[PDB]
Scaffold this active site. Structure first.
Site, short mmCIF file in Angstrom:
data_model
loop_
_atom_site.label_atom_id
_atom_site.label_comp_id
_atom_site.label_asym_id
_atom_site.label_seq_id
_atom_site.Cartn_x
_atom_site.Cartn_y
_atom_site.Cartn_z
CE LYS A 1 -3.98 0.18 2.37
NZ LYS A 1 -4.93 -0.03 3.53
CE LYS B 1 11.68 11.06 -13.26
NZ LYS B 1 10.78 10.72 -12.07
CG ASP C 1 13.77 0.28 -14.92
OD1 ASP C 1 13.78 -0.29 -13.81
OD2 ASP C 1 13.07 1.27 -15.11
CG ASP D 1 4.45 0.34 -18.83
OD1 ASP D 1 3.97 0.21 -19.96
OD2 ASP D 1 3.77 0.30 -17.80
N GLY E 1 8.95 6.86 -20.59
CA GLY E 1 9.14 8.25 -20.23
C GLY E 1 10.44 8.48 -19.50
N1 LIG Z 1 1.62 8.67 2.07
C1 LIG Z 1 1.71 7.37 2.32
N2 LIG Z 1 2.93 6.83 2.56
C2 LIG Z 1 2.99 5.55 2.95
N3 LIG Z 1 1.99 4.71 3.30
C3 LIG Z 1 0.79 5.34 3.14
C4 LIG Z 1 0.59 6.60 2.63
N4 LIG Z 1 -0.77 6.90 2.60
C5 LIG Z 1 -1.32 5.88 3.17
N5 LIG Z 1 -0.47 4.81 3.33
C6 LIG Z 1 -0.82 3.40 3.64
O1 LIG Z 1 -2.24 3.29 3.95
C7 LIG Z 1 -2.39 2.87 5.33
C8 LIG Z 1 -3.48 3.64 6.12
O2 LIG Z 1 -4.58 4.04 5.32
P1 LIG Z 1 -5.78 3.04 4.94
O3 LIG Z 1 -6.14 2.21 6.10
O4 LIG Z 1 -5.59 2.50 3.62
C9 LIG Z 1 -7.09 4.12 4.70
P2 LIG Z 1 -7.59 5.13 6.03
O5 LIG Z 1 -6.91 6.38 5.76
O6 LIG Z 1 -9.01 5.09 5.74
O7 LIG Z 1 -7.10 4.44 7.21
C10 LIG Z 1 -1.03 3.04 5.98
O8 LIG Z 1 -0.82 2.10 7.00
C11 LIG Z 1 -0.04 2.92 4.86
O9 LIG Z 1 0.36 1.55 4.65
C1 LIG Z 2 9.09 2.96 -8.69
P1 LIG Z 2 8.22 1.61 -7.85
O1 LIG Z 2 8.25 2.00 -6.35
O2 LIG Z 2 8.94 0.34 -8.30
O3 LIG Z 2 6.73 1.67 -8.50
C2 LIG Z 2 5.49 1.34 -7.76
C3 LIG Z 2 4.31 2.32 -8.03
O4 LIG Z 2 3.77 2.20 -9.40
C4 LIG Z 2 2.31 2.05 -9.37
N1 LIG Z 2 1.92 0.96 -10.33
C5 LIG Z 2 1.25 -0.22 -10.09
N2 LIG Z 2 0.91 -0.88 -11.18
C6 LIG Z 2 1.31 -0.02 -12.20
C7 LIG Z 2 1.32 -0.16 -13.61
N3 LIG Z 2 0.88 -1.22 -14.26
N4 LIG Z 2 1.62 0.94 -14.32
C8 LIG Z 2 2.09 2.01 -13.65
N5 LIG Z 2 2.41 2.14 -12.34
C9 LIG Z 2 1.95 1.07 -11.67
C10 LIG Z 2 1.91 1.72 -7.90
O5 LIG Z 2 0.70 2.42 -7.47
C11 LIG Z 2 3.11 2.15 -7.04
O6 LIG Z 2 2.80 3.43 -6.42
#
Ligand SMILES: Nc1ncnc2c1ncn2[C@@H]1O[C@H](COP(=O)(O)CP(=O)(O)O)[C@@H](O)[C@H]1O
Ligand SMILES: CP(=O)(O)OC[C@H]1O[C@@H](n2cnc3c(N)ncnc32)[C@H](O)[C@@H]1O
Ligand SMILES: Nc1ncnc2c1ncn2[C@@H]1O[C@H](COP(=O)(O)CP(=O)(O)O)[C@@H](O)[C@H]1O
Ligand SMILES: CP(=O)(O)OC[C@H]1O[C@@H](n2cnc3c(N)ncnc32)[C@H](O)[C@@H]1O
Lengths: 295, 295
Positions: A98, A190, A207, A211, A214
């Site tokens: 997440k 970047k 890499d 994909d 870019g």
């Molecule tokens: N900015 C972010 N950086 C890292 N993790 C994040 C970030 N935003 C949210 N998350 C993930 O989302 C979790 C908490 O949010 P969720 O439970 O998905 C939704 P809510 O905000 O409703 O609790 C965190 O424990 C983390 O894993």
């Molecule tokens: C640079 P990375 O940390 O290896 O890339 C992960 C991010 O790319 C996004 N991602 C997931 N599936 C994707 C896809 N098919 N195309 C583009 N980005 C993707 C995810 O939401 C995640 O934030």
């Protein structure tokens, strides 16, 4: 004995793997009924056989995932002894945690789905995150593709190389390639800065997945602008979607080197085969021999 | 309805958290029988309560893991409504994949064990690999520690900073801290080269775990030798085992900054508290408010 089935994602690679192994591909039609529902006919009995299914979950990802799951179900209910999944390209690998709120961890769900369907083991190649190997509780062998890209460049007799990571999370990979060629590394930072000495060097951008292109093309041009003699680019998985080809063709990339983990026009490219590597992984898994030898 | 229990790993942190939440730590004693086996006495009835257990699986890791699992079992059979695990430091998080043959993926096994024992959810901090969040199928919140270390450095009024990653796999982390401090990054490339401009800059070395201190101290001295004005070092988890303290004390590290995710004599250090962060998270989990509000 050993039966190998190819689904629709990469028939060529499958056929190549079957031939290297020395067996005929399994008889089975994997079609689609008029309504787009997947239809599967395994035209030879497979009771007690060790089945290997070859499928990349590449575009269109959701279709390939479903016909793979449906095939696993067919084999399980048909009494296959083992159902071994060979996945050259693991779609959804990028959604490995997440990153933001309420996001699914799709690579994990896929893993749960495959096990639920009935998979016995998986053979995967260059997973976007190696931790994905831990998403499974069934055995899974993770093969690297860098040695294949490394061998090709070494054969080009290049001089003054610098391996460049296109972003922060690719440095480990860049390092595995640098190690094999006995070269330095530089990284694109970047927020587009260049951390490392690339002046008058042949830069090789690496890499795992290419994909939309870019970052990679953008990084190439900047490498040249900042003094690199010439830029090469390589990746294991050529997703190349959107304006990728358009962009690559128009960039300063001298040659784009990829593997056939995903089925494909690009002007300056070279496709290397992972057929021998997978075939050999298959044999060893099947003859219960050490796979570590492939590393 | 809300009860917080502390096991043996980090009593201080636990009490701090409970004070912020405003509850008295739950009544239970986790002791040892004469032979070394865990004995667990829960002095009050907890039927229908939401229990939160606070335990870092730090040294000795296997003991803390077992008393945690045994506590979970006691709560499950005593009819707790939910059993929520707050893990400030997740031991075994470094074994997150098969880096070489026949290795276990312990971080995953721990996850499987916790769910089997009966855990409802986990709140973790700075996991060695964020993909570990996908090793679970129960909800898991992953709090971040960088913002805490960043706030403390901004208060130093250091100028001309460069954030330095002690190795290839720490560049993403280094980048999150650089972003905060709007600074550049350099990386240590040991095969010991330094990729990036560190000449006349205050270098901040950042890693997630500081264990034996070999790489970090070694990197510090090299930073200085190569022209850095001074070196700071920070991490979220102070494992500091072996000759770590010995080494840190004798290095050119101006100040080692850590958090109290793990209980600790170092001369130039500063311990910041993750107590406020974990406490607010517990409150939001229990109340069902947004946790992402915290990022
Ligand atoms: N900015 C972010 N950086 C890292 N993790 C994040 C970030 N935003 C949210 N998350 C993930 O989302 C979790 C908490 O949010 P969720 O439970 O998905 C939704 P809510 O905000 O409703 O609790 C965190 O424990 C983390 O894993
Ligand atoms: C640079 P990375 O940390 O290896 O890339 C992960 C991010 O790319 C996004 N991602 C997931 N599936 C994707 C896809 N098919 N195309 C583009 N980005 C993707 C995810 O939401 C995640 O934030
Ligand atoms: N050097 C390597 N690089 C990365 N991982 C490797 C390497 N050597 C082995 N492994 C891991 O170990 C797996 C195969 O090893 P195992 O099947 O445990 C042992 P055996 O050697 O008996 O096949 C690979 O799929 C890979 O995940
Ligand atoms: C920095 P990394 O690339 O994530 O390191 C992973 C490797 O560190 C090692 N590792 C696992 N458990 C560890 C521990 N507690 N002590 C030291 N190193 C550990 C293993 O060899 C593992 O393959």
């Amino acid at each position: 004995n050993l039966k190998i089935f190819s689904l629709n994602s990469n028939p060529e690679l499958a056929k190549e793997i079957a031939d290297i192994v020395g067996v005929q591909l399994g008889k089975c039609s994997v079609t689609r009924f008029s309504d787009g529902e997947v239809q599967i006919n395994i035209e030879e009995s497979i009771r007690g056989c060790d089945c290997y299914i070859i499928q990349s979950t590449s575009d269109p990802v959701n279709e390939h995932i479903m016909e793979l799951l449906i095939m696993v179900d067919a084999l399980k209910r048909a009494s296959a002894k083992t159902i071994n999944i060979v996945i050259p390209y693991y779609g959804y690998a990028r959604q490995d945690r997440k990153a933001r709120s309420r996001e699914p961890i799709t690579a994990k769900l896929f893993a749960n789905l495959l096990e639920t369907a009935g998979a016995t083991r998986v053979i995967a190649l260059d997973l976007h995150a190696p931790q994905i190997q831990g998403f499974f509780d069934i055995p899974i062998d993770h093969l690297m593709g860098v040695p294949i890209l490394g061998e090709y460049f070494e054969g080009k007799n290049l001089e003054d190389i610098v391996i460049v990571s296109p972003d922060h999370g690719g440095v480990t990979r860049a390092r595995k390639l640098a190690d094999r060629l006995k070269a330095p590394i530089a990284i694109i930072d970047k927020r587009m800065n260049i951390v490392g000495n690339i002046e008058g060097k042949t830069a090789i951008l690496i890499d795992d997945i290419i994909d939309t292109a870019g970052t990679i093309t953008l990084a190439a041009n900047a490498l040249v602008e900042n003094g690199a003699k010439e830029v090469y680019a390589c990746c294991t998985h050529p997703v190349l979607s959107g304006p990728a080809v358009e962009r690559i063709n128009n960039s300063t990339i001298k040659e784009l080197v990829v593997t056939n983990s995903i089925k494909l026009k690009i002007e300056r490219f070279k496709q290397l085969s992972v057929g021998p590597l997978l075939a050999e992984a298959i044999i060893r898994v099947h003859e219960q021999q050490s796979v570590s030898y492939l590393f």
